[PDB]
Amino acid sequence: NLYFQSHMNVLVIGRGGREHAIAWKAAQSPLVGKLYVAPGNPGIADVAELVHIDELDIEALVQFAKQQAIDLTIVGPEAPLASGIVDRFMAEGLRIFGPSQRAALIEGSKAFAKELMKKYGIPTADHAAFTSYEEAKAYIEQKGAPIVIKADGKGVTVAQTVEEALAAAKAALVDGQFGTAGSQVVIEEYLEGEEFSFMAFVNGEKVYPLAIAQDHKRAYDGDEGPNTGGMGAYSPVPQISDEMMDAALEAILRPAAKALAAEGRPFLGVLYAGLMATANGPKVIEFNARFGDPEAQVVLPRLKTDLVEAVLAVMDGKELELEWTDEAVLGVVLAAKGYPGAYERGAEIRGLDRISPDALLFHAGTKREGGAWYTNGGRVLLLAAKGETLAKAKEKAYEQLAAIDCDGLFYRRDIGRRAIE
Numbered sequence: 001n002l003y004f005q006s007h008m009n010v011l012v013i014g015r016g017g018r019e020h021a022i023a024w025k026a027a028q029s030p031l032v033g034k035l036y037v038a039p040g041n042p043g044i045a046d047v048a049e050l051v052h053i054d055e056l057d058i059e060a061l062v063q064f065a066k067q068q069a070i071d072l073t074i075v076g077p078e079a080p081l082a083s084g085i086v087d088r089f090m091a092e093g094l095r096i097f098g099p100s101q102r103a104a105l106i107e108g109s110k111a112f113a114k115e116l117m118k119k120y121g122i123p124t125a126d127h128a129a130f131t132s133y134e135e136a137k138a139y140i141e142q143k144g145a146p147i148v149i150k151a152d153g154k155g156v157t158v159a160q161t162v163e164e165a166l167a168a169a170k171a172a173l174v175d176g177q178f179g180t181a182g183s184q185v186v187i188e189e190y191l192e193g194e195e196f197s198f199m200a201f202v203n204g205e206k207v208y209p210l211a212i213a214q215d216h217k218r219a220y221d222g223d224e225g226p227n228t229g230g231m232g233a234y235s236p237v238p239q240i241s242d243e244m245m246d247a248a249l250e251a252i253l254r255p256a257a258k259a260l261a262a263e264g265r266p267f268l269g270v271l272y273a274g275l276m277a278t279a280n281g282p283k284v285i286e287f288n289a290r291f292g293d294p295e296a297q298v299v300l301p302r303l304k305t306d307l308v309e310a311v312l313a314v315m316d317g318k319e320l321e322l323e324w325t326d327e328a329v330l331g332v333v334l335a336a337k338g339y340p341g342a343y344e345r346g347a348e349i350r351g352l353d354r355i356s357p358d359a360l361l362f363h364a365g366t367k368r369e370g371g372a373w374y375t376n377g378g379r380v381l382l383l384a385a386k387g388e389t390l391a392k393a394k395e396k397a398y399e400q401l402a403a404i405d406c407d408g409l410f411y412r413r414d415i416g417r418r419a420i421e
């Protein structure tokens with residue numbers, strides 16, 4: 001079907017498991033000649049050449065890319081995007097998949113995203129910020145309870161009653177941090193239902209849906225403890241109906257891409273909708289402007305289509321249908337004890353050699369030294385397995401995980417548990 005230029009040098013920006021997953025996929029493309037990741041990490045060195053340049057060193061990255069004749073740059077994390085790498089690259093004539101600074105604002109500013117979804121009729125949790133008690137009060141009292149109250153400067157209360165919400169909102173203003181605008185309180189609609197991650201390739205108004213993943217954000221078994229970058233994920237997600245999926249594509253993803261374009265911020269890249277499946281249909285929690293982590297590690301193994309060709313087709317504004325395997329994929333994050341708090345580095349990791357070769361081991365935060373492996377970051381590794389069903393992928397993933405010994409790491413035993421229940 002689609003022809004593109006073969007023997008294309010590709011650069012991936014980032015250092016994590018998402019970027020291990022995007023490099024591992026890229027390396028399998030019949031289109032790719034040379035594959036660099038800047039800065040990557042020692043498990044990524046197995047699939048790609050590492051480049052010792054920071055993600056935020058935009059001028060070095062531009063100079064590296066001109067000089068090593070990079071045909072495609074794919075940006076992993078959001079900070080480079082929020083800093084204008086795409087803008088710099090385009091002005092230099094370098095081809096890049098990722099949003100402009102102005103488009104990436106959809107993730108950077110939750111206020112801006114709320115503002116855009118309100119103006120364009122996009123379903124989401126109601127959101128409002130106040131520096132006045134009396135105005136906070138009058139608003140809490142129209143909206144009623146349960147209600148989220150958020151204090152700046154733990155400070156998140158899901159107030160079960162109106163009286164509690166007011167007590168919490170009053171405290172937020174009296175004890176929260178005094179910014180240059182005074183103290184402020186954030187009030188949000190509480191939503192119930194099942195969370196899901198809906199990513200799509202986007203170029204302007206053109207939206208190309210990926211598979212649907214579910215992430216597990218809480219640190220501990222039974223969705224306990226604080227929130228994290230994500231402790232595991234799987235795809236597909238059988239308890240989210242096709243109808244909910246289509247509602248979210250037509251009432252959320254397609255209108256956000258339009259809204260960004262209508263505001264003179266067209267988006268190019270991965271638009272990642274963090275969603276709730278409510279009784280009333282799907283509702284935005286947040287938007288992200290790039291692949292989710294650990295969502296990329298579980299979605300990208302299911303993609304049949306060549307990843308580099310799909311990116312090029314998207315950048316060209318070409319027609320494309322993405323093809324996916326029937327097999328489910330589930331992934332478990334091993335994190336350094338203490339994460340998402342203060343965590344210890346430098347614990348020896350044994351047993352990486354013992355893992356079956358069809359297991360997918362995505363390095364996020366490891367170091368290699370004197371021929372051994374050590375923890376070096378909050379999320380350290382993700383192990384995913386494929387399975388004919390979700391339960392089989394769950395079984396495979398956990399069985400393989402147990403080959404790893406590290407007294408400095410922990411992981412959730414309940415990834416996927418509800419979905420199989």
Ligand SMILES: Nc1ncnc2c1ncn2[C@@H]1O[C@H](COP(=O)(O)O)[C@@H](O)[C@H]1O
Nearest residue numbers: 125188189190191195217227274285286
């Ligand atoms: N309005 C909401 N309704 C339900 N869950 C939420 C809401 N906001 C945040 N969360 C949860 O808290 C996590 C952290 O997102 P955030 O609160 O924007 O940092 C999300 O990934 C959700 O799992």
